[PDB]
Every structure is written in C-alpha cells, then in structure tokens.
C-alpha cells in the first residue's frame, strides 16, 4: 500500500494510475479535492461513466455487484465511488467489501471515501488483500501550529499576497474549518483582483466560524490561555454541544493532576509520567500545569465540578455554562473570590 498526502497526489497520478484508491480522513475539503483530482485524471485517461453509492446495510449490494460484473453498452473504464459510514465498517460490510474485491478488474476503478479507520477497523481481510495494489491518502486537519503554513501555501497557489497579520486573523477566525478558509480566500480574491490582501481588507470581510472539540478546551485550560479557553467554550455552546461530555473530559485530567501533585512530593515527575502512561508530547504541558498551580487550586475546582454536576442532574438547571466559564477562569491564574465556589 502506497501511503501519501493530499499535497503529493498530482505527481503520482501524472506518473500513473492504480487499481484502487482509498481516501480516509476528517477534513471534507482535502477529501473532496483529492476525489476531484482523481476523477479528472481518470476522465483524462478515458474513464467516462461514474457512479456513487453510500455504504449502508439498508443499501443493496446486488446492484453494485451487477454493475461491477456488467459491461456498458457504449462505454468502458467505469468508476465506482463508495462512501463509508461515519461510525465505520461492520462485519457484514467487511464481508461485502471482501466479496467486492474479487469482482474488481482493470476497467473498474474503486474510490473509497470515509472517516479515518481505527486499529480494529483497519485490520481487515479485504484491506490487507488490497494493500498490495492500493494507494491510501492520509487526510488529517492541520493543528493550529501547522495551520499558518497551510494558509500561506494556499495563498501562494492562488497568486495572493497575504500578510502575516492577515494570516493570523484567518487562522484565528476559521480555525478547524478549512472549507471556510478556502471560500474566504476565493471571496477575497474576487473582491480585489489586484490580490493585495492587507490586514484591513481581511478584517472587513471575515466572520467567526471556528470549530473546536472538548480536547482543545482542556488543552487551552492546561496552557492557561484564558481568552482561547473562553472563545472555545463560547463556540462549543453556540454549536450546541452537551456539557456532559465537557465535564467528563475535564474530570479525567483534573483527577490526574490532583494525583500527580499529591504524589509529586515523594517521586520524580518522570517516574510518575511513566507509571501513568501519559503521551510524550503532553508531558511538558502536564509539568507546566503542575508547576503553575498548587494544592490550594485543583481542590476548589473539584468542588466546582461536583456542584455543577449536581445542579445539572438533580436540579436540571440551565446555568451550567456560567459555572463552566467560572471553572475555566479558576484553572487559569485568576483570583476567583470563592463566593461562587460555595466552599
């Protein structure tokens, strides 16, 4: 199996085609761009007919198998596209894919698009069989650190002069949503044919459409960026995310920090990290968080979390978000007069 990235597909396609292609990832923009490039190359090579299906146990595989076995009246080199379910392949779906693999031939070109497969999902007889003659594309949304590089590359590709301040503004406003970034770049290019994208021009034609996850909120809390944490929490509230997931995500890290701080007085930090099986990249952030606050904090935080959970469940209240913001400020280096904690 040839592993590649969306930035390295044009050269491979120009060099030659392949029996099948697999597109796995999370970002819709890169996936659709790869799909479009592959389809354009196939059409240039004579693939005229294109058919699309969504993988689903409700959907019938008989039609797909008949299409694979059948031959068009006045066409050749058909293209078949399969959209995997968001949850992932099931045992029945795995068996159906294994059956389909045999039907594959030279003219038929299979393109699979779907979410990234887990370790168990990746382990499959059909996947292993096709690995010998398959090209896989890794499509992972770049992190905030990697985002400005991608934005600069996109601006250069479209022949746009983008300033550092404009790059930062675009990264902040449309973090985690590459499709919005691309559409904003297109709109800006249309607005000014000259292509001189100054900071005011971008500021006057940009809206807030960032997308975040609870893990990002917890990481921001650990870092201590109060503004970033508040922005992430506001975005999560706006998009309609249940606070239960946020609470459970924060609970694990809070308890881990409490335990480490309690045990840090007698054991080296590295030994504790090794015992608790923490990620290597997270060790620095964990150490910074531990050194940033003392046992006085991380104890009132537990009280806040318990009170918030009780209010959510027993009372079925609606002030959960205010308590979450207060806890976020408390985790950051803030006074937190402690009347709200109700100690």
């Amino acid at each position: 199996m040839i592993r590649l990235y969306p930035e390295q597909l044009r050269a491979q396609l120009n060099e030659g085609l392949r029996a099948a292609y697999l597109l796995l990832g999370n970002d819709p923009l890169l996936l659709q761009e790869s799909q479009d490039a592959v389809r354009q190359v196939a059409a240039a090579q004579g693939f005229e007919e294109h058919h699309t299906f969504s993988i689903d146990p409700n959907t019938d595989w008989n039609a797909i198998f008949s299409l694979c076995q059948a031959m068009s009246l006045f066409a050749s080199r058909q293209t078949l596209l399969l959209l995997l379910p968001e949850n992932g392949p099931n045992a029945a779906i795995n068996e159906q894919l294994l059956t389909l693999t045999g039907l594959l031939h030279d003219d038929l070109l299979l393109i699979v698009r779907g979410n990234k497969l887990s370790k168990a999902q990746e382990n499959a007889a059909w996947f292993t069989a096709l690995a010998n003659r398959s090209v896989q594309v890794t499509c992972q949304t770049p992190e905030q650190a990697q985002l400005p590089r991608w934005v600069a590359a996109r601006a250069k590709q479209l022949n746009l002069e983008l300033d550092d301040a404009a790059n930062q503004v675009l990264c902040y406003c449309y973090e985690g949503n590459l499709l919005a970034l691309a559409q904003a770049l297109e709109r800006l290019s249309l607005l000014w044919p000259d292509g001189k994208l100054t900071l005011p021009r971008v500021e006057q034609a940009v809206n807030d459409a960032a997308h975040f996850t609870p893990f990002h909120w917890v990481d921001a809390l650990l870092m201590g960026k109060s503004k970033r944490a508040l922005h992430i929490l506001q975005q999560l509230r706006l998009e309609g995310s249940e606070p239960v997931i946020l609470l459970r995500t924060l609970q694990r890290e809070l308890l881990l920090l409490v335990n480490l701080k309690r045990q840090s007085a007698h054991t080296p930090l590295r030994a504790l990290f090794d015992k608790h099986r923490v990620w290597q990249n997270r060790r620095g952030m964990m150490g910074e968080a531990l050194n940033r606050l003392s046992q006085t904090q991380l104890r009132q935080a537990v009280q806040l979390l318990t009170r918030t959970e009780l209010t959510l469940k027993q009372d079925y209240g609606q002030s959960v978000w205010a308590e979450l913001e207060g806890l976020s400020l408390l985790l950051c280096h803030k006074p937190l007069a402690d009347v709200f904690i109700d100690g």
């Binding site: 249309l190 109060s226 503004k227 002030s319 207060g326 400020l329």
Partner: protein
Amino acid sequence: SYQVLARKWRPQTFADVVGQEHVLTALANGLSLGRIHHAYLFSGTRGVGKTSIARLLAKGLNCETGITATPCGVCDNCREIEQGRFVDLIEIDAASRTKVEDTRDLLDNVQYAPARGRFKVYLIDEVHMLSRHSFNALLKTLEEPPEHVKFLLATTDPQKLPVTILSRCLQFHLKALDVEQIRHQLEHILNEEHIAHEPRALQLLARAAEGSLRDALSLTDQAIASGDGQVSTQAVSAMLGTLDDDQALSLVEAMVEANGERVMALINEAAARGIEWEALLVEMLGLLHRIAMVQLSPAALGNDMAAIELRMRELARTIPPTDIQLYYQTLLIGRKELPYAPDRRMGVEMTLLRALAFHPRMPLP
C-alpha cells in the same frame, strides 16, 4: 390603501441595498468577469436581506440586455421577475414542501431547458427545513448541474445543512446592519413618505431594531399608528416602555445605585407585565455573575450580550468586586427563601430591600 413599508419598500438594484458591501461587490465582480458558480448559499440573521439579494441576482442573470452586475429593471424579464411571474424563475418554499415527493417533481423538471431566459434559476428559501432524502436528491442535482441551471439557497441557520451541500456551494454571510445604517434608511424612507419625524425617535427605533432593518420598519409602522401619522419621540418612548424587557438589568443598576424609588417603580412595572418572579431573580443572579466574570477578565462577554454589553461593562468597571459578591450572596439567599414567603412579589421586594440596605452578618467560626 397604504402598503406595509417592508413590503412596499424592497430593494430593486444593488445600489438600493443598504450595507452588505462585500457580498454585493463580490457578486458584481463575478458577474462582470463571467465567474458564475453553480450554487450560491446566503446566510445571516433575520431581515438582513437574503431573499432580496437573491432576487436581485436572479434579475441580473436573466436580464435581456446581458449578464450585467446591475440589472436594467426596465426590460420584460426584470419586470416579470420583480412581479414573480417570470417563466423560468421558480421560488421553491422548502418550509411548506419538505416532502421528498414535492422536491423530486422539481428536481426532475430541472431537465427541461429554459423557455425564455438564459438560465433556469431555482430559488430555494428556508432550505434548512428539507428532509434527509430531499437533501440527498439536492446533493445529486448539485453533483450533476446542467450548465443552463443555477441554484440560489437562503437559510438563517446553515448549520443544519449537511457539510456536502456547503462544500458544493459558495457561501455568503450577511452581517447585521449597523445602527447608523438603519437610522439613515429609516430617515430616507420617512422623507420619501412625507411623514414628520424626530431624530431621537429615529435613534430609539434604530437601537430597538437590534440589527434587523425589518424590525425597524415594523416598529416605525407601530410608531406611526400610535402617533397618528407622526413619528413623535413620545410615542416611540411609550411603545418601548410598554415592550421593554430589560427590567432585570435596570433593577440591578438601581440596586447598585441604592435608589429605592427606582427599584419600586421597576418592581411595579414588572408586576404589570406579569414577569415570573423566580425567573427575574435567576436573571439578576446571572447578570451579577457575568459582571463578576467581566471584572475578572474582559473577554467574558461575546455576541450574546451585545445588546447590553456597554451597560454590563460599565457596571463591571464601576462596582468594586466585594459589593458584587455581597449582592450575589444576598440574592442567592433571597432565592432560597422565596418559596416560603407568602407572596413571590413580597419575597422579591424583601430580597431587593435587604440587598439595598441590610448587610448580612457573615457567620463566625
């Protein structure tokens, strides 16, 4: 037979549209250069002009003279589109046609070539209400759009739409109109209507609009009705007082200033309106908590409190934190005691008086 200002006064050219400069400029440049995307999506708040801009774009695309950024407005096609009688203009109301069998009959008619116009425009409004299978059919159509067919989509909440439709469409987000723009538009409309007005009345109407020009026009109509053909400041003030709902913040301000008379007046006004007392206490507690958060960090407020952001920030700047904590504790105790009070209004009055004057004695160890 006077007509509603919102219905009577509608944009007819990109020049008439107030604000939304970026979207109009982008559309004009695209039309001039010939870059026409196969699907456009319009998003924004209420009364920002999504449907008006969509109709103007439809006029521009099918104008007899040519594909011009600014439609002439005099040719037969422009008039028919304005009247909603154009042969190739189809205005699908997804709200009342969420069924699959209703959308399929139109996606099938997409096949036929336009009778008169260059393009067979399909204007779908309130697209977010369509069903899942309808979304699938629309996705198929957008995947294979004939070169002579265009799609215009308007939705207040684009989040509901599947990501595939968003990817296969060019999005345009319309910003909420500023206070000055709404005031200027109201002044122009009233001047063209030969109706007397006062600057303070216009300012109050613009403030009450909250970024929706349609709300501004509705309030202007109400003021004209109340003022007997005149937009007088007295009538606008009376209307706003009758429909005012910021009584919680006013009560908080009065409590901070320690003015009993204003507190009593606000309580009487709330009693006349019938606002729930426990809800009022909860709102006051939330306001105090948010003011404390603002004092801790200015980034506490976002777009949710944009209506009353200035007052909240001023209170945060002025009030010392300790007074805010004391008021919060007093109101919390009052909320705890409210159920046992003989009357909820009586409990609220007692709590407010206690916060004003009676300082709780902090328990000793």
